[PDB]
Amino acid sequence: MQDAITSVINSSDVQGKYLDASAIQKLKAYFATGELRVRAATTISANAANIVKEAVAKSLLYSDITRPGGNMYTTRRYAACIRDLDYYLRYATYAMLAGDPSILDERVLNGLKETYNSLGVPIGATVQAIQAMKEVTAGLVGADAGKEMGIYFDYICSGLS
Amino acid sequence: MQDAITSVINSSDVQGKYLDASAIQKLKAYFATGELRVRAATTISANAANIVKEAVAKSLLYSDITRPGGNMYTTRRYAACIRDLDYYLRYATYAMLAGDPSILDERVLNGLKETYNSLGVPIGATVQAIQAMKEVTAGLVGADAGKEMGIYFDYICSGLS
Amino acid sequence: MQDAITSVINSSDVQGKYLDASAIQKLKAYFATGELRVRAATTISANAANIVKEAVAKSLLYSDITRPGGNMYTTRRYAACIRDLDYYLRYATYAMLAGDPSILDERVLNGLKETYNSLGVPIGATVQAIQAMKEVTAGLVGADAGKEMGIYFDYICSGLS
Amino acid sequence: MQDAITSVINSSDVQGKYLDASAIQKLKAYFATGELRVRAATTISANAANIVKEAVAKSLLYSDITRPGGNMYTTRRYAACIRDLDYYLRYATYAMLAGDPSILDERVLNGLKETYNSLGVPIGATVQAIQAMKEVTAGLVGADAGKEMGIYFDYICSGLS
Amino acid sequence: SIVTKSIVNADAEARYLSPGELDRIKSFVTSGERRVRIAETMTGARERIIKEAGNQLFQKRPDVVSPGGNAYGEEMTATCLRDLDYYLRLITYGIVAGDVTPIEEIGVVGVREMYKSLGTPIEAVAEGVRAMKSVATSLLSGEDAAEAGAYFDYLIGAMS
Amino acid sequence: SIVTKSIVNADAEARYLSPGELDRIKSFVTSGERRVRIAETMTGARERIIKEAGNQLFQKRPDVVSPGGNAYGEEMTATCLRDLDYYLRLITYGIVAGDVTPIEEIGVVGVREMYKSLGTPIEAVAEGVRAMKSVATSLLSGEDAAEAGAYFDYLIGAMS
Amino acid sequence: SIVTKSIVNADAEARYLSPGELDRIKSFVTSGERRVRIAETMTGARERIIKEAGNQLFQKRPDVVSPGGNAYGEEMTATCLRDLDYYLRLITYGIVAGDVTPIEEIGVVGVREMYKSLGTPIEAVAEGVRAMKSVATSLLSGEDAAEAGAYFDYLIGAMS
Amino acid sequence: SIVTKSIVNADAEARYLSPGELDRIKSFVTSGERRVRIAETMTGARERIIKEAGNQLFQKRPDVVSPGGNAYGEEMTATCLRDLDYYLRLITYGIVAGDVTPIEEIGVVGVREMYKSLGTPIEAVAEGVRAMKSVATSLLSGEDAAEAGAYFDYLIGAMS
Amino acid sequence: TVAEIKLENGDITVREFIRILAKSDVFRNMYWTSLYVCKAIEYIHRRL
Amino acid sequence: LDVVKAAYRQVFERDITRAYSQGISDLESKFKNGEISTKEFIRRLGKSPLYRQQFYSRFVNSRVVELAARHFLGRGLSSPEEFSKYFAIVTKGGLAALVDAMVDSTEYADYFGEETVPYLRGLGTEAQECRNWGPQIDLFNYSAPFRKVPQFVTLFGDYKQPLRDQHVYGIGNDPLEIQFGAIFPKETRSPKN
Amino acid sequence: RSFKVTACVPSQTRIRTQRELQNTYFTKLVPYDNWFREQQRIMKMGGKIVKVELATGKPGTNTGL
Amino acid sequence: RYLTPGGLSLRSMRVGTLAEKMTMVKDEPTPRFVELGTPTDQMKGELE
Numbered sequence A, B, C, D: 001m002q003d004a005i006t007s008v009i010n011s012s013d014v015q016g017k018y019l020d021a022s023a024i025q026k027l028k029a030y031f032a033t034g035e036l037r038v039r040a041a042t043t044i045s046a047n048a049a050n051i052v053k054e055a056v057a058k059s060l061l062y063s064d065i066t067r068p069g070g071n072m073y074t075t076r077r078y079a080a081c082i083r084d085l086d087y088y089l090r091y092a093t094y095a096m097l098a099g100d101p102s103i104l105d106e107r108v109l110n111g112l113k114e115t116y117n118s119l120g121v122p123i124g125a126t127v128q129a130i131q132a133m134k135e136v137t138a139g140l141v142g143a144d145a146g147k148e149m150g151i152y153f154d155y156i157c158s159g160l161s
Numbered sequence E, F, G, H: 001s002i003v004t005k006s007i008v009n010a011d012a013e014a015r016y017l018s019p020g021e022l023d024r025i026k027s028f029v030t031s032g033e034r035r036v037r038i039a040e041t042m043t044g045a046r047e048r049i050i051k052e053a054g055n056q057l058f059q060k061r062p063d064v065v066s067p068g069g070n071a072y073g074e075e076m077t078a079t080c081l082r083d084l085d086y087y088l089r090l091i092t093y094g095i096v097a098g099d100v101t102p103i104e105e106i107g108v109v110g111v112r113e114m115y116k117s118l119g120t121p122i123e124a125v126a127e128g129v130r131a132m133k134s135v136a137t138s139l140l141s142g143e144d145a146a147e148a149g150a151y152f153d154y155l156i157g158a159m160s
Numbered sequence I: 001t002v003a004e005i006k007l008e009n010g011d012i013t014v015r016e017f018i019r020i021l022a023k024s025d026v027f028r029n030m031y032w033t034s035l036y037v038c039k040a041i042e043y044i045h046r047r048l
Numbered sequence J: 001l002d003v004v005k006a007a008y009r010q011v012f013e014r015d016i017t018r019a020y021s022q023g024i025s026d027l028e029s030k031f032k033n034g035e036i037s038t039k040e041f042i043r044r045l046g047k048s049p050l051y052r053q054q055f056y057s058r059f060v061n062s063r064v065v066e067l068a069a070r071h072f073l074g075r076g077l078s079s080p081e082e083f084s085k086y087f088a089i090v091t092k093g094g095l096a097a098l099v100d101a102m103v104d105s106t107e108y109a110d111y112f113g114e115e116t117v118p119y120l121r122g123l124g125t126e127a128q129e130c131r132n133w134g135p136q137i138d139l140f141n142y143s144a145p146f147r148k149v150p151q152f153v154t155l156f157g158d159y160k161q162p163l164r165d166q167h168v169y170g171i172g173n174d175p176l177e178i179q180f181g182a183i184f185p186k187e188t189r190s191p192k193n
Numbered sequence K: 001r002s003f004k005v006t007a008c009v010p011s012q013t014r015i016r017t018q019r020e021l022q023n024t025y026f027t028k029l030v031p032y033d034n035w036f037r038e039q040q041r042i043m044k045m046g047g048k049i050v051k052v053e054l055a056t057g058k059p060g061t062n063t064g065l
Numbered sequence L: 001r002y003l004t005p006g007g008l009s010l011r012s013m014r015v016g017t018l019a020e021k022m023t024m025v026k027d028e029p030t031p032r033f034v035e036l037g038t039p040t041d042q043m044k045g046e047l048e
């Protein structure tokens, strides 16, 4: 739940002392990179229905999985697969705006073995969808913002496998 | 640890009475089909390495799970999975001969839902593979013993979940 | 959930094919016995307090499972036990009428073996109850429809044991 | 731990040939005399306490070594020798069913000689006890089964001496 | 049974069942029809075999009956005759089971210190089952009373 | 030997052999004259099977006979036939023993270690004893080949 | 890596980081820029190595490509170039790490059980990675081909 | 059939057929039930003969399915299994009729001018039915495979 | 039934009928008294 | 005699000579001779049919490896690779190889060695780890052979996982989803927890 | 098959861990199947095997454990 | 309205209710030598 601000003032609360100059320097390291994230979080929010559109066509479409016998065959399953991908963009922008992958341990990595195993979701196609989604996102957002966003995409698929 | 013989012994022991005529009818039913199971337990233990490379190649290979991301992408995890699946064929033909699924319940089926959710394997692809092991054995020892095998494969997949 | 028509659609949907001449005789064997099963259900429901009466009269009454040192003894636990036997018969009406045991595996066989160890009621008396319910039913409905009702009786007994 | 079955297999393999005609006649010699060996075994397994009960009363009791000053004056020692004598009958039974002293050679003989002299056990008092016990079993089992009883109790009596 | 003792021996070696073990189960079910004739024969002669073997028990050992012993009481012998019937409950099981596997965990495991606690002599039971054996070998033919007497005399030495 | 498996079973619990176990030996000894008659059909037809099952092998697996294979050349395939001829010889030890422990301690303890180094495909060896099974069972009577086919059958599964 | 292996050995003796493994690690990390421009050139020419060692394997082992072998058919021999694509991909992880614990945890520890369960000969892969080594030493310069060629030579020892 | 071949043998000499020829009809029809039992298990195992005898053919002779050969390609391999599938239909036809004459009147009049024109080697198509003989006799029992194998031998005898 | 005939009259709605159902002693005995507290928070949250 | 009392007490968790009147008596005689060492007396006890009737055929193979380590090694499993070494031995040769791979280990002979009995190594007798602090003292209790679901592998794998889907207050606060009843995994009946 | 062995195995850790020292130079029957894992274990501690003598087993069999 | 993911394995991972969840049958077609052998006319009467 916490961010780079509320990890510093949580860890400096619990020692009992006030905010000191070793911890304010950690806040200024977040405040120097804060302007980079708000430009990064704006452009993904205007293209959330289009990053998902291209990345499904990057790795998922015209496969076994799109075809019958695969998993995303029925229209009912298909939309869901966009929707079960669209949380992975919205929660990754929240952790990019936070500067901490503490949202991602908390909202979007709880059942993520056990929901997907108890629904017939293949894990190995979701990890292949996400670095197909990371490549089009870092192309859309830039080289500098792409590696900060690239931590929180690779935080998800490492916890998902 | 019980047989289809000794369960009729034990269920006529908690009541404390002797062997009734329907209890001897349960023992004469098992003695009548006694030689059928031993003609199957030779032939399945003959081809115990041939079924495990057939049912895996039927419903588990060339999917995404052998591809990276999935739970069969490692050579540590391919050889663990054949070790995970040789146990299901070996304990079934143990339970074929005894006529009792009590061997499966306290040797295989006790911690199997709880380890598989802990290690993060697909239960849905395992229960695919044990059900893929059904029609290979049904097409090997004939339809009579295979339908008698199918009560003990469908006790495994019922007890996985 | 699904029945004999929905499953053979869903067996032929996930292959991607149409309804071939190898699946129409699965429907034609269902539609030939379509008039047989509807007469089978309408004599179950007219006798449904007597099939559950004659089933316990051969197994549970005048034994020492209804002794004061017994599981059945308090009348809270009796009226549950008739009702826990009501729900085995009424869903067995359904699966015979559907032609597929999938409604049994969703609601009756949900967690029933793991509730019973958590309660302490015996399982070995319950298979004696339903197999006493099977011999009452096939005499009442008829030796044709008692055969197909005997499958869905023993499918519960395969899941309890 | 080899058998008359196996020693004619082992002598046929240290040559490296098949089962010849001389190897057949050794085997049919075993199968002709093997039927009375099982009938000899049931009697000595039945009277395994009654034989040792009067074997000590013939030779051990009311002598110097069960007197004070003797070896067997302690109740540990008198319990040990009955434990020593029940093993000598049980292993000679195991030598009787195989028909060879190779069962008697591996288990019991390698440590009786040097440790009875280490523990002060009189071997020269032990040997007439067990060859009295070889006399009382021939009256119990019959004369024709008594001769091959007499050749392995001699093999113990040669190994002690 | 002989099936479970073939299985849990072959489960500890983590292999399948050997064909040396698979003829053992195959010859067992062919000879199972003989021993279930014995189980109907022992069960029908149940009420006869208790009272006469106890009658031979009393003349051999009167210490249970006499005062100073345990069963000096008109209820206290009635639990003794039920206790003999508890063992013939087991003897007809292992004849059908083809082993002494129902003799073991129901009847013989804790009996050396159970009877030490209760004050009954464990040696005194060992002739009562032997007096039961001498009547049970009389009603049965000798090619079947040899094996049915062999299940008894396992338990005789296992008591003492 | 099925006798030796019973001795180590009864020695490991420090007890005599149960009458369930002695019934197995009594069925083994009275069938032992039948056991030698199984081997005499196979010894007298030893050269018939190996020349047949060589040709049964080399149609199903001619990757061996083609060059680059493990037994290429007529000096090598004579050694491949005596590797078959050991296994027909060993089965006649295992039939008359009753157990599979002469097949084990002679042939299949380290057979996945030797044939790994020797370069031969062990799946072709498991084909080869299966090619040896189909002709040798047809030479026997069908009741004797039910028991004798099982000693063939453990040699199939313990290969691969 | 080596840095894991130096910690894990020093953690087992429960001391601090020794002057020994302070200088193994420092000599590793000042060679860290040299190994990545070794490992880039493998990934920079991954389509040439797979095509050349694919050309080099199938002339050495024509039993594989010929029908009845495992990689037969245009879908199956495309998978054997993919089966070698992983092992070239793993070697670049081992060159960067400076050890073979990327090779060990991903591509070694269950190989012989898997390739027996797939039907392929195990030693035919051991020729192919050895043929993959013979085109990788022609890429690099001489003093680096001894370093990167040792990681190929580890993978041969896991197979055979 | 032998009924057709004996009517027209008696039709040219224009009299009623002899009891020496009528008894051959009587032995034909009384053994008529057994020959349908040979055929009706081959028709039920029709797909699992041709897929393996084809794969035993291309493994034994690889130049046919190799490119440059006649049966190269997934279409040409499929039509060169129908050329094997057609003969399994006629062998099941010859087993029912009792004689080789529904093969001689259908399958083998002009094969040496058919496959000379089509380009396939006639020696290789005689090898495939030899692979079909070694598959189908293994799927049949010990006694009945000899009478089925003679019609397999006539098909190889007509091409060679 | 005195909770029930208010619904059959129309004097209460169904949402008021569920509240007057699960405040009874038969619901309180079955799922509150005979359970752990945070089990019984979760199970009434599961049903309603 | 009180050594061979405690050797049964260490392996079989209680004195089954005193309480069940049974134990193989030929093995004590080779033990009391000084013929076999105390390492061998454990190992020939571990391959006995008394052990596999008591601690091998009643449990899952993953539960046996956690239960054998508390018997012979005297400690819990410390690492998931150190579990996974011993679990391959159970598929190799079953019980007789598993007790062979653990009693002949260098973890055994460094600590117990040659002529002493194994003793369980609790807190205070040596330093104890922090990774498996929970299920080690839980394994050292007498209620250890009734934990049927395995302890270590359900949490050695869980440390690499993210937070598993359950109820927020533990798995015992999560009812089985059926039509009625409110059944619960009672944590005291069978330790799911 | 089993054979006795006289071996003296010092520990080389009892200075560190401070345990009760058990006095080596033992004699024990090690069986044939378990010996080379136990023999290699004497080499890892650097102990010196003095005498190995075949107690029981009759060296040269092909069957019979 | 909702259910716990461990509870969906209890409901729908059975043997009977698995064909609606994932793929199960995967029918191989007629092999191409069989469909090359038919005369593209599966029925004929008098013209036999």
Ligand SMILES: *[C@H](C)[C@H]1/C(=C/c2[nH]c(/C=C3N=C(/C=C4\NC(=O)C(CC)=C4C)C(C)=C\3CCC(=O)O)c(CCC(=O)O)c2C)NC(=O)[C@@H]1C
Binding pocket: D065, D071, D072, D076, D077, D078, D080, D081, D082, D084, D085, D087, D088, D107, D108, D111, D112, D115, D119, D121, D122, D125, D126, D129, J026, J028, J029, J030, J032, J033
């Ligand atoms: C008996 C008639 C004579 C006698 C014997 C006596 N023996 C012992 C002690 C031991 N005897 C053995 C021998 C064996 N143990 C075996 O397991 C086997 C193979 C089945 C054999 C041959 C051993 C090893 C011992 C030592 C073990 C122990 O003592 O517990 C004693 C006890 C000696 C003591 O001081 O403890 C005695 C008294 N004594 C007699 O009266 C007879 C001459």
Ligand SMILES: CCC1=C(C)/C(=C/C2=NC(=C\c3[nH]c(/C=C4\NC(=O)[C@H](C)[C@H]4CC)c(C)c3CCC(=O)O)/C(CCC(=O)O)=C2C)NC1=O
Binding pocket: B061, B062, B063, B066, B067, B073, B074, B075, B078, G057, G064, G070, G071, G072, G076, G079, G080, G081, G083, G084, G086, G087, G090, G106, G107, G118, G119, G120, G121, G124, G125, G128
């Ligand atoms: C990163 C670690 C890793 C390994 C080791 C690995 C092996 C691996 N090899 C496979 C197949 C294969 N691999 C081969 C390989 C070969 N054929 C030959 O004869 C040659 C010797 C050889 C390679 C040059 C073949 C033929 C198959 C297909 C097997 C089949 O479908 O029957 C498959 C199954 C198909 C699939 O991938 O879906 C796996 C999982 N996969 C991995 O992810």
Ligand SMILES: CCC1=C(C)/C(=C/C2=NC(=C\c3[nH]c(/C=C4\NC(=O)[C@H](C)[C@H]4CC)c(C)c3CCC(=O)O)/C(CCC(=O)O)=C2C)NC1=O
Binding pocket: B065, B071, B072, B076, B077, B078, B080, B081, B082, B084, B085, B087, B107, B108, B115, B119, B121, B122, B125, B126, B129, J060, J061, J062, J063, J084, J087, J153
């Ligand atoms: C005797 C009863 C019994 C069984 C069955 C059992 C299984 C068991 N399976 C394991 C792992 C496993 N089981 C599987 C199996 C599968 N995962 C998949 O993706 C496939 C769908 C499926 C097989 C086809 C895999 C891949 C692992 C390894 C996971 C890992 O190493 O992290 C482990 C952890 C040990 C290890 O990973 O080395 C155990 C203890 N234990 C037992 O005691």
Ligand SMILES: CCC1=C(C)/C(=C/C2=NC(=C\c3[nH]c(/C=C4\NC(=O)[C@H](C)[C@H]4CC)c(C)c3CCC(=O)O)/C(CCC(=O)O)=C2C)NC1=O
Binding pocket: C065, C071, C072, C076, C077, C078, C080, C081, C082, C084, C087, C088, C091, C107, C108, C109, C110, C112, C115, C119, C121, C122, C125, C126, C129, J178, J179, J180, J181, J182
């Ligand atoms: C179809 C879906 C469905 C299922 C699975 C269902 C199962 C079911 N059967 C139950 C109880 C019960 N089950 C029995 C069992 C029996 N009666 C006997 O006396 C015999 C011993 C035995 C059967 C022959 C008993 C006695 C109870 C009451 C237990 C108790 O109140 O303690 C309970 C516990 C309910 C309670 O006790 O409050 C449930 C949930 N109800 C359903 O709607």
Ligand SMILES: CCC1=C(C)/C(=C/C2=NC(=C\c3[nH]c(/C=C4\NC(=O)[C@H](C)[C@H]4CC)c(C)c3CCC(=O)O)/C(CCC(=O)O)=C2C)NC1=O
Binding pocket: H057, H064, H070, H071, H076, H079, H080, H081, H082, H083, H084, H086, H087, H106, H107, H118, H119, H120, H121, H124, H125, H128
């Ligand atoms: C029932 C009597 C009967 C026979 C004998 C028959 C033969 C026959 N085989 C043909 C083709 C063929 N047959 C083969 C067969 C083979 N190629 C090889 O090299 C192998 C040796 C061999 C099979 C084992 C091939 C490849 C063709 C296609 C010829 C081509 O496309 O060049 C064709 C032309 C296309 C067709 O109709 O299939 C005929 C008529 N047809 C019949 O109705």
